[PDB]
Design a protein around this nucleic acid. Structure first.
Ligand SMILES: [Mg+2]
Ligand SMILES: [Mg+2]
Ligand SMILES: [Mg+2]
Ligand SMILES: [Mg+2]
Ligand SMILES: [Mg+2]
Ligand SMILES: [Mg+2]
Ligand SMILES: [Mg+2]
Ligand SMILES: [Mg+2]
Ligand SMILES: [Mg+2]
Ligand SMILES: [Mg+2]
Ligand SMILES: [Mg+2]
Ligand SMILES: [Mg+2]
Ligand SMILES: [Mg+2]
Ligand SMILES: [Mg+2]
Ligand SMILES: [Mg+2]
Ligand SMILES: [Mg+2]
Ligand SMILES: [Zn+2]
Lengths: 81, 103, 135, 71, 39, 74, 213
RNA sequence: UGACAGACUGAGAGCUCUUUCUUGAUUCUAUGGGUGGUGGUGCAUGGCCGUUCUUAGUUGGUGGAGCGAUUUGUCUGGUUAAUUCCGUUAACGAACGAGACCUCAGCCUGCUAACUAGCUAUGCGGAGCCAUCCCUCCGCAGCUAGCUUCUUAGAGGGACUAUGGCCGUUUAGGCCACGGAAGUUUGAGGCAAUAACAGGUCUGUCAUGCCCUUAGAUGUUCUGGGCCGCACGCGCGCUACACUGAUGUAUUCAACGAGUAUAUAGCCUUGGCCGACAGGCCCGGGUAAUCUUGGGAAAUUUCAUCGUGAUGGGGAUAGAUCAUUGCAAUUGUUGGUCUUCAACGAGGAAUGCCUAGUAAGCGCGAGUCAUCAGCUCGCGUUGACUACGUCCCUGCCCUUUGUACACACCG
């Protein structure tokens, strides 16, 4: 994966402000609603948060629901705040 | 003073719609409105034919679904403050109400 | 009057009517066309154009707001597509148009508010009396 | 193909046992009688039952009869 | 360039009324979307 | 309004007959209407009473209300 | 602006998308259904389940995440749709929760015949006119064979199937196959409407006794 | 990590190179494990469906018989669409299936209403007329209705074989006759049992075990071809072999349904103009009983023209051209125009469906759809011959009977 600090931050802000995140499977939109991303980056960094179990993931028929955990709030709190 | 308002109401269920419309109607008659309805409108019948097999063999057998949508309207000769004086009572399940201010 | 008479002889009277009741203009392609895409031959009639006019005249007599497309639709018909199943095919519209401009330039009809073509009060007079002059 | 089934026939026997002097022979009386002495969920079953109890009445009103017990 | 809202399959859709499901996903979710089958 | 062509003829017959009997029954007399009904029902009964027959829906597995696709074993 | 046909279809699709997504989320809470209510200035999602504080999380947090994800996913005006999550008054009748309970009991390692009657006698005591269970797949042998378990009455044809049978289907992920679980449960007539449906079965008659005076 | 100039490659893919800027710990490498697969196995499975099976059949609890598998209940007869009932009765009492239930259609001048539906009457307005008024057809609006027949859809009612007759253990019922809209359960469907089949589907699924593949990929994306290639066989259909017809005028009547912000009018498309046609340009209407469309459908109906002729039946085959959809029409998308005018003389052995608004004839809508409907699913229009039986053939259900069969006579 190749991602900027900027893109990491604009997702990290958004998760710490909301707590949930929703993707879609339809790929190459270049704009996921509510953030600025082409949906590869969100799906895959959130996958990596899943691998490190910072977010619980209920795939729910190709819509990628990611619920942040209090395990991950400490991570993000130690990242931006 | 007394304006002309319309109430557009539709649902999926016969009983439930007939209960809601009669509730609004007797509400109107309690306040002695100039009320005209409930005019019944023809029922729109969405239909689908689907081959009920999921693989495509055996006897070609289809199944038909139909959603009926029942359309109703009532005319009220009132002021909208009276309209919200009335139309705040319980609305029964599944029925849908979309009051419109007319000419 | 017009409703009181057989639906054919009114057209037979009226076809000779707007032949002999003065005359008018007539575009110079009347003799080639099939008058509808699905047709096969030009009409056998020599005075087919006048009978077209008479029929459309009573259409407008007894209805208001008939269009360039509605006249196409009411004169279309069955199209045998070859080995394919036959269907419905609308007739040609530019034949109907110049009929409408003939009856318009004669004042038999005129364009309608709200769209369409309505009979003219005096065109009504023309059709009613020509129908009264039938058996 | 008009044979009444067991539900119809045994409601017939039970109702005409349980209520005799409050039914009559004229069909159309019996319908409403049964509407007020019974609870059902299909007006066609209701007529189906009345149409059989009426000639059960016809046979009883002349002679004796099977199972039903009348005082 | 069109798939099910359900299973992401591009064959046998039911595009009428904007269901955007395939004929099988529509049977699978048929009676809860509200296609009560009187007949 | 509606129907086909012969269907409309057969509606006109019916509506003329039924309007006649209604008009006599309400405005001439019941007994005088009796002769009219007995003449009409003497000629036929379908002048006065509608026909319950309709087009019945076509069932899958063959074009036709009561037909089916042609069947092949081999 | 949208037509009413499209309106009703999209609302039905929303209902179904919830009914499904709320399952993977509320699997380990005993999900049974959701009702959507349209109110003035508000829309409501009535999750109904069998354990409520663990669907709430601690101090109503989990419902907060769920309401946020619904808001966001369906693009609702904020404060638009809110969740209540109540408890099914009776638990032996909602076949979804019983099938799910059989699912966890059967996943955990509990024996199949033990698991099915652990559902079955519960359904019998809890006031149901009958119950059927079918388990199908590869249980202790490769060749597929299906076991049926019963107790009490049951209907299978005609209209009152829809008004009396609460039936569920679930798939289980046992290693070396998948177990299909059908659970059919008969309801009983409650004219109140509270527990079983209101209109009784079309074959029941009540010959009233002849009050005497 | 991305890249400018050129080769390469079609490629304005920086893949690979000459050229060194750019970005900065996001990686790359290697060790496990993942992930993904319209990959395999439907014979490892779920699920759903089809079929056995459109028939009427199946199973416990207690009791009887038997050492036993099993049997009884579930039946000798009568009746039935029916394991539907009467009844007989080592059986008694119960569960599914059948029936009941649901939907559409048929009836109501009875009820609730309805200017998004619609008569009716009056007022004017047009046209004809013993004309001056009237009488007839028309259009417009209403504090016209002691309007709702027509239209819509709610609640109900109605039909139960009720009455009568004959047959019947005068039981279950059956046949007949008035009456009624309805007397095959009124018609048509929906749902539909136990046990199965090694029935179909891993090519519907982030349904799925096992196995194969995991970067030089069966992953994914792109360009092009392919599924459509034709000695030939088979299956469902379309068009015809004409005159009970073809072509050309005129005449006029449905129902089902269908219509995404579709962006700068945009799916259905009205009206006006341009156009021989295809089709274009303009101002519009409708998220719909409002606009399309009160759907002006054909077949059919009259008037001629063809006059038994492979003819003007028939319209395959091909040439030339235009237009629309599409980023793209070639292996002709489709629709026109003009031309070519092919085989087909009522069809061999055999075989399919069908018992009343049914077959057959006719068109329309919908799915598919950027465009392509000879199909499939629905709708209406015209509308019959024969039959009301039988076990002869092909089967299904039950009983007795015989069996050396049980993957069960395809033994
Ligand atoms: Mg198989
Ligand atoms: Mg299977
Ligand atoms: Mg025993
Ligand atoms: Mg013993
Ligand atoms: Mg026993
Ligand atoms: Mg029937
Ligand atoms: Mg192919
Ligand atoms: Mg076929
Ligand atoms: Mg003709
Ligand atoms: Mg020809
Ligand atoms: Mg045969
Ligand atoms: Mg189409
Ligand atoms: Mg022998
Ligand atoms: Mg022997
Ligand atoms: Mg042997
Ligand atoms: Mg042999
Ligand atoms: Zn799908």
């Amino acid at each position: 994966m190749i991602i900027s600090k900027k893109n990491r931050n604009e997702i990290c802000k958004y998760l710490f402000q909301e707590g949930v995140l929703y993707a879609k499977k339809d790929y190459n939109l270049a704009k996921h609603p509510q953030i600025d991303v082409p949906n590869l980056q969100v799906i895959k960094l959130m996958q990596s948060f899943k691998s490190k179990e910072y977010v619980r993931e209920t795939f729910s028929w190709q819509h990628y629901y990611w619920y942040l955990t209090n395990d991950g709030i400490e991570f993000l709190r130690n990242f931006l705040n | 003073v007394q304006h002309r308002i319309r109430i557009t109401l539709s649902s999926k269920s016969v009983k439930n719609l007939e209960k809601v419309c009669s509730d609004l109607v007797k509400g109107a008659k309690e306040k002695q409105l100039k009320v005209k309805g409930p005019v019944r409108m023809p029922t729109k019948v969405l239909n689908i034919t689907t081959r009920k097999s999921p693989c495509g063999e055996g006897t070609n057998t289809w199944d038909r679904f139909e959603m009926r949508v029942h359309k109703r309207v009532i005319d009220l000769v009132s002021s909208p403050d009276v309209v919200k004086q009335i139309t705040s009572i319980t609305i029964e399940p599944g029925v849908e109400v979309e009051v419109t201010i007319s000419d | 009057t017009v409703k009181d008479v057989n639906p054919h002889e009114f057209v037979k009277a009226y076809s000779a009517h707007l032949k002999r009741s003065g005359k008018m203009e007539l575009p110079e392609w009347v003799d080639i066309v099939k008058t509808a895409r699905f047709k096969e031959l030009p009409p056998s009639d020599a005075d087919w154009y006048y009978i077209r006019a008479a029929s459309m005249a009573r259409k407008i007599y007894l209805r208001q707001g008939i269009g360039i497309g509605g006249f196409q639709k009411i004169y279309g018909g069955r199209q045998r597509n070859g080995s394919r199943p036959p269907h419905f095919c609308k007739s040609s519209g530019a034949v109907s148009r110049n009929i409408l401009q003939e009856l318009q330039k004669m004042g038999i009809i005129d364009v309608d508010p709200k769209g369409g073509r309505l009979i003219t009060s005096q065109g009504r007079r023309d059709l009613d009396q020509v129908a009264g002059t039938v058996p | 193909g008009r044979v009444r089934t067991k539900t119809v026939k045994k409601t017939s026997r039970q109702v005409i046992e349980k209520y005799y002097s409050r039914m009559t022979l004229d069909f159309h009386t019996n319908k409403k009688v049964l509407e007020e002495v019974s609870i059902l969920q299909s007006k066609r079953l209701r007529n189906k039952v009345a149409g059989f109890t009426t000639h059960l009445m016809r046979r009883i009103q002349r002679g004796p009869v099977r199972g039903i017990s009348l005082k | 360039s069109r798939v099910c809202r359900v299973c992401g399959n591009s064959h046998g859709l039911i595009r009428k009324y904007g269901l955007m499901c395939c004929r099988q996903c529509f049977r699978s979710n048929a009676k809860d979307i509200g296609f009560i089958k009187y007949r | 309004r509606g129907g086909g062509k012969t269907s409309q003829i057969y509606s006109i017959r019916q509506a003329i007959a039924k309007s006649l009997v209604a008009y006599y029954q309400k405005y001439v007399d019941e007994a005088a209407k009796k002769e009219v009904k007995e003449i009409f029902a003497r000629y036929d009964r379908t002048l006065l009473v509608a026909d319950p027959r309709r087009c019945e829906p076509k069932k899958f597995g063959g074009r036709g209300a009561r037909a089916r696709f042609q069947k092949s074993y081999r | 602006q949208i037509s009413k046909k499209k309106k009703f279809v999209s609302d039905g699709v929303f209902y179904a998308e919830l009914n499904e997504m709320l399952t993977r989320e509320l699997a380990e809470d005993g999900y049974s259904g959701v009702e959507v209510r349209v109110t003035p200035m508000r829309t409501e999602i009535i999750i109904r389940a069998t354990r409520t504080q663990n669907v709430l999380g601690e101090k109503g947090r989990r419902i907060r995440e769920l309401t946020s994800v619904v808001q966001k996913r369906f693009n609702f005006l904020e404060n638009g749709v809110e969740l209540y999550a109540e408890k099914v008054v009776n638990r032996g009748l909602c076949a979804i929760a019983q099938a799910e309970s059989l699912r966890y009991k059967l996943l955990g390692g509990l024996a199949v015949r033990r698991a099915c009657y652990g559902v079955l006698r519960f359904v019998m005591e809890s006031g149901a006119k009958g119950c059927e269970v079918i388990v199908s797949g590869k249980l202790r042998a490769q060749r597929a064979k299906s076991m049926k378990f019963k107790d009490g009455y049951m209907i299978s044809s005609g209209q009152p199937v829809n008004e009396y049978i609460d039936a569920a289907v679930r798939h289980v992920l046992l290693r070396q196959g998948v177990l299909g679980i059908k659970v059919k449960i008969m309801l009983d007539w409650d004219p109140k409407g509270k527990l079983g449906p209101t209109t009784p079965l079309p074959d029941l008659v009540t010959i009233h006794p002849p009050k005497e005076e």
